[PDB]
Amino acid sequence: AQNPNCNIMIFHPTKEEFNDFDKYIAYMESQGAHRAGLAKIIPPKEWKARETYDNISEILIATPLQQVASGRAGVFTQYHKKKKAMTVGEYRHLANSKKYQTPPHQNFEDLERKYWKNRIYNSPIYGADISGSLFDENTKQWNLGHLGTIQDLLEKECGVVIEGVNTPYLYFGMWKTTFAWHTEDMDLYSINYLHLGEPKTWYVVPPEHGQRLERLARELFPGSSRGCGAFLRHKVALISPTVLKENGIPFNRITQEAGEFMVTFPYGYHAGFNHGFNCAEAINFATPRWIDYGKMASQCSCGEARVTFSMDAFVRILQPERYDLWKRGQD
Ligand SMILES: O=C(O)CNC(=O)C(=O)O
Ligand SMILES: [Mg+2]
Ligand code: NI
Ligand SMILES: [Zn+2]
C-alpha cells in the first residue's frame, strides 16, 4: 500500500506532465497521495497563471466577512458578520493596517504559535467565496476555470445528464483569517491555487480517519452536535493541533506559498489560516474515484449549511433516500 503513514506528498510535475490534469491526479493517487487528504503541487518553472497581478485592485468584495470567535484558544467557533462592500485595493490597505497586519515573527512555526495563542482575541475580515477567476484565458495547463465539470463526470460515470454548473471562487485573506474544519460539499475534491501574497497554513486529517475527527468534534461542541448530525458542514468549528494531539487524532500540516497548488481529496477534513494579505482561487472537482464518496457523504438537513444550486442533483441522483429530508433543509 503506497503512503501507509498518510503523509502529505509534494509533487513537481514537468511541463509535459502538467498537460493532462486528470492523468496527473490519477498519478498522484497511484503514489498514495490521497491517503493524506491533501497534496501540494509545485508547477513547472515554465508555467504561469497570468502575466501580472498589477491590475486586480478594482475587483469588488461585495460582502466581506468579519470572523468573530467564541470559545477557548484551542477550541472555538466563528461566526461571520457581514461588512460593507469594498474593493480589493481597499481590502489590501485594510489588511496592511496596524490593526490587522501580520506581527513580527521569526519563521512559519513562530507565526503558527502566535495564531493559536491569539486568534480568538481578534476578528479578521475575509473576502471569501467571490465567483470569478484570475487565470489568463490563454493559460492552458491547470487553469481552474477550464476544468472538466462535475456534472460531466457524473454523466460520464453514471449515464445521467443533470443540470448545474461548476465555477471557481476567489478568496482574499488577511492575517488570522480562518477556514474551519470541513470536507467539501458531497465529499468532492478541491483544488486551490495561491495566486499572490502571504502563505496559507493547512491542517488535514487522513480520509481513513475522518470519523475520529467527527467523534472529537461531537465531544468538544456538544450543543452543536445535538443540533445537527453533520454540524461540521456548517463550517464554523476550529480545533488546534495541540488539542488534536492531546486527543490522539491523526493529522498533518503544511504551509502553501504563492505559486503553489493544493489538492484536497474526498473526505479529507481540512482547516487553516492565512499569514497576511493574499488571494487564492479554488474549485471543486470529481474523478471516477469520487463517486463512491459522494454516495456516502453526510449531509446537514438542519437548515444551517445552505449550499449551491448544483448540489441538488448530486443528492438527488447519488442519495435518493436522503433527498427529501435534505431538500427540506434547503427550504
Ligand atoms: O482557502 C480557504 O479559505 C479555504 N479553502 C478550501 O477549503 C479549499 O480550497 O478546499
Ligand atoms: Mg481590477
Ligand atoms: Ni475546502
Ligand atoms: Zn446542520
UniProtKB/Swiss-Prot annotation:
Principal place of residence: nucleus
Names of required cofactors: Fe(2+)
Domain (JmjC): residue spans on this chain: 136-302
A Gene Ontology cellular-component term: pericentric heterochromatin
Binding sites annotated in the UniProt record for 2-oxoglutarate: 126, 192, 200, 235
PolyADP-ribosyl glutamic acid modifications at: 16-17
Subcellular location(s) of the protein: Nucleus
Keywords from the UniProt entry: ADP-ribosylation, Chromatin regulator, Dioxygenase, Iron, Metal-binding, Nucleus, Oxidoreductase, Transcription, Transcription regulation, Ubl conjugation, Zinc
Ranges for domain JmjN: 8-50
GO biological process annotation, one example: regulation of protein phosphorylation
Cofactor note: Binds 1 Fe(2+) ion per subunit.
Function: Histone demethylase that specifically demethylates 'Lys-9' of histone H3, thereby playing a central role in histone code. Does not demethylate histone H3 'Lys-4', H3 'Lys-27', H3 'Lys-36' nor H4 'Lys-20'. Demethylates both di- and trimethylated H3 'Lys-9' residue, while it has no activity on monomethylated residues. Demethylation of Lys residue generates formaldehyde and succinate.
UniProt-recorded name of the protein: Lysine-specific demethylase 4D
Organism name: Homo sapiens
Gene: KDM4D
